[model samples]
Target: SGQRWELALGRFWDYLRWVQTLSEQVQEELLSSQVTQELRALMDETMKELKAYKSELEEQLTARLSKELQAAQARLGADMEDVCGRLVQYRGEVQAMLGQSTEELRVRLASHLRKLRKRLLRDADDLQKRLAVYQA
Candidate 1:
C-alpha cells in the first residue's frame, strides 16, 4: 500500500524492478531450508490444482449471483407492483373519506390518512431493504 503512495510520485517502478531480484533483499526469510526447491516444484502442481479449484469457485459464484440477482429482481418487481396497488387503494379510500364533507367526518378521514401514511412509510422501508441484495 505504501508502494502505491510511491507510485503517485513515480518512484515505484524503479522500486518494483529492484525488488524483482528476490534473494538480494535485506536477509528476509527463506533461509537454508532445502524446501525452496520442493516448494517451487510443488508450486507448479499447486498452480494447476488451484486453477481448477478457482475455476470451480468462480462458476459456483456466478451461478449463485445469477440466481440471487434474478430472485431479487423478481421479488422487487412483484412487491413494487403490490406496493403500488396498495397505495392506489389507499388513495381511493382517502378520496372517499374526503367525500364526506362534515367536520367530524373530516377528523375520521384524518385519522385514516395517518394510518395509511404509516403503512406507506413502513412499506417504503421494505422496498429500500429489498434493493440491498444487489449490492455485491
Candidate 2:
C-alpha cells in the first residue's frame, strides 16, 4: 500500500510538472483552454486504478488473516484441552493429599481457565472485526 501511494504520488507530481510548464508557456491561454479536462480524466483514471488495487489488496489480506485465525483457533483449542486435563488431575491429587474437598480450589482454577478462554475469545472477536472491516 505504501509503495502504491508512493508510485501514485510520483505520477501525480510528474503530471503537475508538465502542467506547470504548459501554464508557464501559455499563461492565461492554457487556463482559458480545455486542458483541465485532461487533468480531470487523469484523476478519474487514477482513482479507478487505485480503488481496483485496494480491493485486490483487501482480498489478499483477508485470505491471509483468515488462515492465521484458523491456526490460532486450533492452537487455542488444543491448549485449552491440555491445560484442563492437567488441571483436573492435579486438583484430584491435591484434594487427596490435603484431606479436604478442594472444591474452592477447583472453582478458582475454573474461573482462571475461563479468563484464559476469554482472552482468546476477545482476540477472536477482534479477528472477526478485522475480517468485517474488509467488508466495509
Candidate 3:
C-alpha cells in the first residue's frame, strides 16, 4: 500500500512539473514583442472582471454558510437543554420514590433514566459530529 501511494505521489509531481513548464512557455509567449498593447489591455480588463465576480461569489457563499451553521447550532443546543432538563427531573423523581420505599416505582423510574441517558449520549454525539463538519 505504501509503495502504491508513493508511486501515485510521484506521478502527481511529474504532472505538476509538466504544468509548470507549460505555464512558463505561455508566459513568455504573452510577453513577446509581437503582442500588442491593445491585447494586453483587453486581457487585464477580463482578469479584473473575473476577480470581482469571484469576490462577490465568495462573500455570498460565506454569509449563507454562516447563517445555516448558527441556526443548526441553536436548534441542537435547545434540544440538548430540553433533554438534560428531563433527565434531571426524572432523577429527582427516582430519588424521592426510593426514599418512600416504592420499589416498583423505582424500577420503572430506573428504566426511564437509562433510556434518557442513552438518548442524550446519542444526540450529543450526533450534534458534535455535525458541528465539527460545519466548522471544517
Q: What clash count does candidate 3 reach? A: 0
Can you write out model 3's per-residue Cα lDDT over 30-88, one digit (the tens) per residue?
Answer: 23422223233333443344334333444554356546544544443443344334334
Q: Rank the candidates by TM-score, best first.
A: 2, 3, 1
Weakest 10 consecutive residues of candidate 2 by summed lDDT: 22-31
**Candidate 2 Cα errors over 4 Å, as ranges:** 1-9, 21-29, 63-136
Q: Between the candidate structures 2 and 3, which one is better when assessed by TM-score?
A: 2
What's the TM for model 3?
0.33
Which pairs clash (backbone N, Cα, C closer than 3 Å) in model 2? none
Query: Model 1 misses residue 41 by how many Å?
Result: 70
Instruction: Provide the lDDT at 72 for model 2.
Output: 45
Model 1, residue 104: what's the lDDT? 48
How many steric overlaps are in each model, in order? 0, 0, 0
CA lDDT of every candidate: 0.36, 0.46, 0.40
Residue 20 in candidate 3, Cα distance off native in Å: 64
- What is the per-residue lDDT of model 1 for residues 1-136, given as tens digits with 9 covering 90 to 100? 2122222212322322232233323113222322233333333343344334333444554246546544543443343234334334433554567555334433543455455445534543453343343233
- Of 1 and 3, the candidate ahead on lDDT is 3
Please list all clashing residue pairs in model 1, or write none if there are none.
Answer: none
- Give candidates' CA RMSD values in order: 28.5, 27.8, 28.1
RMSD of 2: 27.8
